Amino acid sequence: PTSIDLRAEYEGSGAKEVLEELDRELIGLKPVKDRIRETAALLLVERARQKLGLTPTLHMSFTGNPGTGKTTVALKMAGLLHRLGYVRKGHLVSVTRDDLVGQYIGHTAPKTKEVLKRAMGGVLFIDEAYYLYRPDNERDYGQEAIEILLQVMENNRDDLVVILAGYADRMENFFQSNPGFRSRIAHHIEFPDYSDEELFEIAGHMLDDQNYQMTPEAETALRAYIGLRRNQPHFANARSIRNALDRARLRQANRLFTASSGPLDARALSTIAEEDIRASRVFKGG
Amino acid sequence: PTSIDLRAEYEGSGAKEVLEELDRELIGLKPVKDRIRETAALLLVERARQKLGLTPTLHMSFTGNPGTGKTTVALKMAGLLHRLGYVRKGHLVSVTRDDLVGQYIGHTAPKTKEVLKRAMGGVLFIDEAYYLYRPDNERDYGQEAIEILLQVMENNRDDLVVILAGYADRMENFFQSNPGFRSRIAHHIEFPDYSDEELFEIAGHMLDDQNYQMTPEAETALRAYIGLRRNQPHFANARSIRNALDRARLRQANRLFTASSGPLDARALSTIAEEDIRASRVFKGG
Amino acid sequence: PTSIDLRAEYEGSGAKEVLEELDRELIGLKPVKDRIRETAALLLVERARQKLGLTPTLHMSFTGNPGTGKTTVALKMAGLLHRLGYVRKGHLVSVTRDDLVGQYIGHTAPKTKEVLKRAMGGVLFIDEAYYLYRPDNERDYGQEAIEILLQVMENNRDDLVVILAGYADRMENFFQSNPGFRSRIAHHIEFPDYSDEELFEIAGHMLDDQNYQMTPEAETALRAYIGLRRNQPHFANARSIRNALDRARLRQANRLFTASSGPLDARALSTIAEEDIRASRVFKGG
Amino acid sequence: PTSIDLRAEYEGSGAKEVLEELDRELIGLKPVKDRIRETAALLLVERARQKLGLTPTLHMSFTGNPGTGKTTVALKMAGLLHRLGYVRKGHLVSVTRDDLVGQYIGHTAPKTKEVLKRAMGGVLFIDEAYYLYRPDNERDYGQEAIEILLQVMENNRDDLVVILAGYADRMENFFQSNPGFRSRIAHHIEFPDYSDEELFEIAGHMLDDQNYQMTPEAETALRAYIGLRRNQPHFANARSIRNALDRARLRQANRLFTASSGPLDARALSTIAEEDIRASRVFKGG
Amino acid sequence: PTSIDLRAEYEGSGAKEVLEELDRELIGLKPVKDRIRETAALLLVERARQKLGLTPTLHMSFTGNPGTGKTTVALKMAGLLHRLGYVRKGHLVSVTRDDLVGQYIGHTAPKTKEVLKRAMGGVLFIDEAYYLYRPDNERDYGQEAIEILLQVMENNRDDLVVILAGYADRMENFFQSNPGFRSRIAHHIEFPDYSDEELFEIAGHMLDDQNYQMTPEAETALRAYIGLRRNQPHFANARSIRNALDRARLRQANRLFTASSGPLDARALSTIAEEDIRASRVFKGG
Amino acid sequence: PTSIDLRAEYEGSGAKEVLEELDRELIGLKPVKDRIRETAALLLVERARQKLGLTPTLHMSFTGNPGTGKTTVALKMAGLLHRLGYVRKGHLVSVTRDDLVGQYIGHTAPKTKEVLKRAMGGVLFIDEAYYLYRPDNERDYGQEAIEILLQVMENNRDDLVVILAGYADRMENFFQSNPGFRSRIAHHIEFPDYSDEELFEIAGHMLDDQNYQMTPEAETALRAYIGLRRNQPHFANARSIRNALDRARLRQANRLFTASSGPLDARALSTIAEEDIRASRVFKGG
Numbered sequence A, B, C, D, E, F: 001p002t003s004i005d006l007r008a009e010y011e012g013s014g015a016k017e018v019l020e021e022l023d024r025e026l027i028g029l030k031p032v033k034d035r036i037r038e039t040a041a042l043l044l045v046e047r048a049r050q051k052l053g054l055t056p057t058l059h060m061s062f063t064g065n066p067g068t069g070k071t072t073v074a075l076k077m078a079g080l081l082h083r084l085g086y087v088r089k090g091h092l093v094s095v096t097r098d099d100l101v102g103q104y105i106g107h108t109a110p111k112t113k114e115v116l117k118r119a120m121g122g123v124l125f126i127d128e129a130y131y132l133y134r135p136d137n138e139r140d141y142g143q144e145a146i147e148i149l150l151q152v153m154e155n156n157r158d159d160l161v162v163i164l165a166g167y168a169d170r171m172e173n174f175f176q177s178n179p180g181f182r183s184r185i186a187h188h189i190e191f192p193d194y195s196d197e198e199l200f201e202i203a204g205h206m207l208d209d210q211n212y213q214m215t216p217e218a219e220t221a222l223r224a225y226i227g228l229r230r231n232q233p234h235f236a237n238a239r240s241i242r243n244a245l246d247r248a249r250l251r252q253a254n255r256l257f258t259a260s261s262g263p264l265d266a267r268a269l270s271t272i273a274e275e276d277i278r279a280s281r282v283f284k285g286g
């Protein structure tokens, strides 16, 4: 070997098969998907470079709001990384701060370490990682977990990848207070969402996750709803959406229970109708 | 099975028998009772949907003032939930923050866990839950109880339902500081009551709970009392009501002891008369 | 039984015999004594009501200054309560915060619990109870004692009565910080004593407690003293009174030792004379 | 017995023999000595009253500056108290805060208790007692010592007397923060000192304690010194006196070493001469 | 021996062979290299002085930014020091604060001590040493590590050299708070890198460390980039450089993957082209 | 014996031989040396007084800047004290706060105590003692070391002398906060040095301690240097001097290494020349 065919590796790795898996398994967020397509390319090239004699550097940060594909992309990353020979067992260990820090004084270091043992050969995924740093609280022993984490991200490299994730404002603050992470994360990925279309996409995903469908009439009813809701006080984006869908679901349940034609099937029970949304006082004025 | 008769489940579950039990066992708060009627409908439908292949999501929050039916509705919920096959042993474990958090450093995690063991197959009911988060205090180890609680509400699902309850202002603040609860509570129920009529309803419920009745004359005497009391300093709503009723009870006891016609019966001993309320310095001016 | 003769219970209980015992054993504070007379009536009636099928609710708070009869009334309460079948062994366990909270981390819960064991069947009396809540101090474990106390006042009812006592300003603050006590205390009793007459009453009680009498001339000498003292800086009410009486006692002792007519009797040794008070620089101007 | 001869007890107790012992063993502070004479009288009378059927109340506070006779009066008190049958073994146990509070968490309660065991039948003397209350410091466990102390001063009475002593400003503050002491101290004794004569008395006592005498010429030299020193900045009363005497002693030593007539005797070595004081830059202007 | 030939020692030690090793193994930072050349001279002379009868004093501080040669110079120091007979086993033990301080209360002193055992006969290298002093955090036991460190730097001298390193602002602050280090460091070495040329040098070193080269066209493209970037908000110097190079690398990877002429060699894969930098929105205006 | 020949003791003790040792072993600071001469005289006399029947009082404080002879005088004191029979084994135990206070909670009292055991029969020397009082820090247990120290300085006297030393501003503050030390220190010794001449003396002592001499030309070069340096920002007195001498030493080493006439002797290697100082940018303007 002297040169390297990139497409040979791309087609030989099954990396394309994981990138396809990502398009199919994430309701269109092309922005992000392209960014992962691009990182795949770099990950490919870096590997081809390592195969011609030139340890990588892999850790990444995923920042954005709830419901932007952080977890489901992270899973695919572990895949991709296992397919490009960066990781041995391409498996994702997803953990919060409450899996790494123990209440008792000294029961944190074995806990982080053992979680790490389970992570080895794959990817550790620390959701809202910045919660490990709580000097707000006394008797929270999260600084030890940081120390052990930080030490691992520099030293014990070739057998682990770490992904910190969560809100960006909170992550960037976490790096201020705990530097040495910025230099250890090679991949900062922003997960963007909200515009009406985005809020509607969210509404749609939420309903897919619950196995409910809207009737076309109800879809337009929601689009109306959203536009109005965003001009009323204390609009909470995604929360306001969950909340509307919750109340819609409650209304749909009562609509059906009160009708009672007789037996009804999955479509009748999975469908949110125009009535269920338009009955909201959001359409009255509040 | 292909369609599902909802009324068949509603009548087969005995869910109606628990909803009747609620009307009979809660002095009219039709507002709330309708909201529970409605949630019952959704809980019904969701179940019928789970029975056609489409884990639920059950936790709820009860917000409002003291004396609005939070506990007595929660009890009925545990019933309803057991009747709709969501819960195995339909029993309510009611706990405050002082049942989950221990003084000693590490004697909290076994305590929360064991309470949880007692809760399993039924409903855990955390009154004024927001008191678990006390970063105001040092040496209070309530954050561990939150961690264990939060972990349970996501992971170990199909064998427990949690109801956080208490004042709304304090609950919404608690979610700010401890997010991840908002997404875990599927049912936000507001318990409304204060207007004179509400204060009078409260007075009425308090007296029912103690087995005392008022004479019509005394009722109007209280309505007079309330209107005056609310314009005097340090009006404490429900507390001022308990306090007036306490003093009325004391006056009624002394009225009866001092009269002493001879023997007297349950009505004489259960009745608060016009004298007992009007004797208050609230009618003098203070 | 269908009706109930109240006087039959009042005379059968020996409750009157304890109320007489109170008049005889408390230098006239008719205000309070009437309030206890009245509570007795209610306690009577409530009992007669429980005997016709209609658990009581018994805990109380005693608020006021040192030397108003809190302890000596509490003792009689335990009596009264035992005579009306509310309490099994009518005995009063009087405790401060230093009997419930231990220095060591975890040596508080057995200590509160064991004190409670000694209290069972009678009345526990927590003097200046608000001292259990010291978040001012670190390493004071008083919050656990509160938790155990609070739990007992709701759950393990029919075998214990609790009386919190002390200054009112401090008690009401204690309820702010630790709510759930207000609802558990059914009896708020205020112990009143300052106006000149009150200061003089205090002076009088203090001297009774020490077995000293004043000569009429000395009484008027004190009334003069008080009026002057209250217009001088740093007037501390009751403390200033103790302090004057202390100095009077010292002067009386030296008056007698220096005279030495020969032997002298109890009256000579128990009497504070006009000289003993008027010799004060309070009469000179300071 | 019906009356009581006071002089009989005063002469029979040997109380006079301890009061004489006080005059002889305290360089004239007649102010204080009279106050102790007076307290003796009251202590006498109270005893004669207890002997005619009318538990005492004994604890006291000694406030003032260093070098006013607090300790040497306290010793005599223990005497007096043993002679008037208030105390069984008339012995004084003198302790600071560092004898009652231990560093380790829980090694304070046995330490206070054992000190107290040694105190029993006599007088415990807590110098600068207010140092037991250090909420300024964390990991100081002085509040437990307060609790145990306070409990002893009310409950276990007839076998112990406590004397808190030290600066008055600091003592009165200590009572603010720890009330319940004011009511437990029956004897507040102020120890007054400074006027030139007092500063000179102090100088004199200091030199007696060290076995040094001044020559009459040097005495007048000091009186000159004092008057000047008090008008220069940062005058520290007693400290400035120690400091002058220290420097005088140093000068006297060098005066003698440099002279060296031959052998010299106790007078030559015990004497501070006019040279030793007048050589001070205080006489130059600084 | 009477005089000493310095060049004899310089050539006999192999000290020159380590200084050559430094030029070859550190991409030109002549500023620093001269400072190390100079220190070598002094270290030489001091040794020649010790060999004529006149314990040295060796500890040093390395201050500057990431990527200025601190570690790679420290390694050579250990060499040099071993070649001039100051150190027995010329080996460098590189440690952070997380290797010296343990979470548990008392598991720090054995940990520092054992690290020190491994350090003996060579050089201990504490990166960002100032992190040992964290009074910001409770339950961090770093002050003990300071104590043990400080004690070693004075007492147990002839068998250890310590090098504290990191940012200068943070180091000088660390000396304020922990004095006694300034007197123990005999060698303060500043590591300089920002001016455009410096930022470009940094960019260059970063790319060397990653095995990437720029085409001359791309170099000028970066110089353009830098000048623009420094006038846009939140310019973070070196971070902004890493960030640009990261994004350039990502663009280079995608440029190559998308072209796909066929096989490509190390130069094609190591080269960042003009396209990869100029594609930045920094050239659009943001 | 009746009188006492002082010169007999002075010549018999070998006290003169230690005072000579002080002149020879401290580069002229006649001010201090006279003060120690004088204290010797007093220590002599006090001893002669104790030998004629009239426990001493020995502890002292040494205040001043770094480099004024505190340690080297303290050593001689231990000598002197052993020669005048005040101390049994005339040996000096020199300790900082980091030798008395342990990190762990309770590992301070054995540590202070054992250090004290090593001190017994000689002098304990606490450098910068005021660092034992750190209420600035939590989890520093220095107050216990104070307690044990303070207790020793009063009680266990005849087998230990304590010397607190360091900056005066910081010492006097330490006495404010921890009184009872002022009365326990019988000897306050001020160590004076800064004026140009003093800075030059310091420079001179520093160079003696390192075995370097200046050429007369270089001395005047330093005097020039000092005058300029003190008018430039952040002048740090003694530190600026060390720093200049360090850089001079570095320059001298490089001057010699670069010349290389051939062999060179101790004078050439010990000498700092005019070149080595004048090459400083302090002479350029910065």
Ligand SMILES: Nc1ncnc2c1ncn2[C@@H]1O[C@H](COP(=O)(O)OP(=O)(O)O)[C@@H](O)[C@H]1O
Pocket: A025, A026, A027, A028, A029, A064, A065, A066, A067, A068, A069, A070, A071, A072, A165, A166, A191, A205, A209
């Ligand atoms: N891009 C997406 N495509 C499909 N579903 C999504 C997407 N993003 C979020 N969701 C839905 O919202 C939930 C949020 O998932 P997650 O990745 O864990 O969020 P986070 O951004 O906090 O990491 C998912 O379980 C899923 O049901």
Ligand SMILES: Nc1ncnc2c1ncn2[C@@H]1O[C@H](COP(=O)(O)OP(=O)(O)O)[C@@H](O)[C@H]1O
Pocket: B025, B026, B027, B028, B029, B064, B065, B066, B067, B068, B069, B070, B071, B072, B073, B165, B166, B191, B205, B206, B209
């Ligand atoms: N809605 C209601 N209907 C009948 N009684 C009520 C109602 N609300 C409150 N009460 C009375 O007041 C008490 C308050 O009960 P609870 O549910 O525990 O209050 P919360 O949960 O809001 O703190 C009840 O035990 C009952 O006696």
Ligand SMILES: Nc1ncnc2c1ncn2[C@@H]1O[C@H](COP(=O)(O)OP(=O)(O)O)[C@@H](O)[C@H]1O
Pocket: C025, C026, C027, C028, C029, C064, C065, C066, C067, C068, C069, C070, C071, C072, C165, C166, C205, C209
């Ligand atoms: N109402 C009263 N009648 C007679 N003596 C009283 C009365 N109140 C207080 N005293 C006297 O003052 C003391 C104060 O007693 P206590 O009841 O324990 O005070 P408190 O409970 O208010 O703290 C009593 O021991 C008693 O000698």
Ligand SMILES: Nc1ncnc2c1ncn2[C@@H]1O[C@H](COP(=O)(O)OP(=O)(O)O)[C@@H](O)[C@H]1O
Pocket: D025, D026, D027, D028, D029, D064, D065, D066, D067, D068, D069, D070, D071, D072, D165, D166, D191, D205, D209
């Ligand atoms: N009234 C006094 N008569 C004789 N000596 C005194 C007197 N007051 C103080 N001293 C001297 O000063 C020292 C201070 O003693 P002490 O009673 O302990 O002071 P404090 O007021 O702090 O309790 C004594 O040991 C003694 O040498």
Ligand SMILES: Nc1ncnc2c1ncn2[C@@H]1O[C@H](COP(=O)(O)OP(=O)(O)O)[C@@H](O)[C@H]1O
Pocket: E025, E026, E027, E028, E029, E064, E065, E066, E067, E068, E069, E070, E071, E072, E165, E166, E205, E209
């Ligand atoms: N002077 C230099 N010469 C060549 N490469 C350097 C130099 N300084 C830094 N680097 C590069 O940057 C990285 C920073 O290394 P390091 O010395 O550990 O940083 P620091 O000690 O300043 O924290 C090195 O691994 C190296 O690849």
Ligand SMILES: Nc1ncnc2c1ncn2[C@@H]1O[C@H](COP(=O)(O)OP(=O)(O)O)[C@@H](O)[C@H]1O
Pocket: F025, F026, F027, F028, F029, F064, F065, F066, F067, F068, F069, F070, F071, F072, F073, F165, F166, F191, F205, F206, F209
């Ligand atoms: N008076 C002095 N005479 C000679 N050398 C001194 C003198 N003062 C300081 N030094 C030098 O400086 C160092 C400072 O010593 P030290 O007594 O420990 O200072 P300090 O006690 O004031 O902190 C000494 O070891 C010595 O080399």
Ligand SMILES: O=C(COP(=O)(O)O)[C@@H](O)[C@@H](O)COP(=O)(O)O
Pocket: A234, A235, A236, A239, A240, A243, A244, A247, A279, A280, A281, A282, A286
């Ligand atoms: O509180 C909200 C919604 O808050 P959010 O913006 O969080 O949804 C009100 O608009 C509803 O109570 C009205 O319900 P309905 O629309 O059924 O009347």
Ligand SMILES: O=C(COP(=O)(O)O)[C@@H](O)[C@@H](O)COP(=O)(O)O
Pocket: B234, B235, B236, B239, B240, B243, B244, B247, B279, B280, B281, B282, B286
């Ligand atoms: O303190 C209150 C009532 O407070 P609250 O508002 O909490 O009831 C006074 O009005 C009563 O003491 C009067 O009693 P009465 O009315 O019997 O004179």
Ligand SMILES: O=C(COP(=O)(O)O)[C@@H](O)[C@@H](O)COP(=O)(O)O
Pocket: C234, C235, C236, C239, C240, C243, C244, C247, C279, C280, C281, C282, C286
């Ligand atoms: O300090 C006080 C009294 O304070 P309080 O107001 O607390 O009593 C002075 O008036 C007395 O010292 C005078 O005593 P006499 O009156 O014997 O001179």
Ligand SMILES: O=C(COP(=O)(O)O)[C@@H](O)[C@@H](O)COP(=O)(O)O
Pocket: D234, D235, D236, D239, D240, D243, D244, D247, D279, D280, D281, D282, D286
């Ligand atoms: O510091 C002081 C005294 O302080 P204090 O007021 O505390 O004594 C100066 O007056 C002395 O140094 C002078 O000594 P001398 O008088 O021997 O010159």
Ligand SMILES: O=C(COP(=O)(O)O)[C@@H](O)[C@@H](O)COP(=O)(O)O
Pocket: E234, E235, E236, E239, E240, E243, E244, E247, E279, E280, E281, E282, E286
């Ligand atoms: O956030 C930054 C860079 O921050 P930093 O200054 O830290 O690099 C934006 O300029 C980029 O998102 C633009 O990327 P591109 O230049 O590829 O559009």
Ligand SMILES: O=C(COP(=O)(O)O)[C@@H](O)[C@@H](O)COP(=O)(O)O
Pocket: F234, F235, F236, F239, F240, F243, F244, F247, F279, F280, F281, F282, F286
């Ligand atoms: O930082 C300082 C000195 O600080 P300090 O005042 O602490 O010495 C500069 O003057 C030197 O870098 C110049 O060195 P040179 O004089 O060799 O150029």
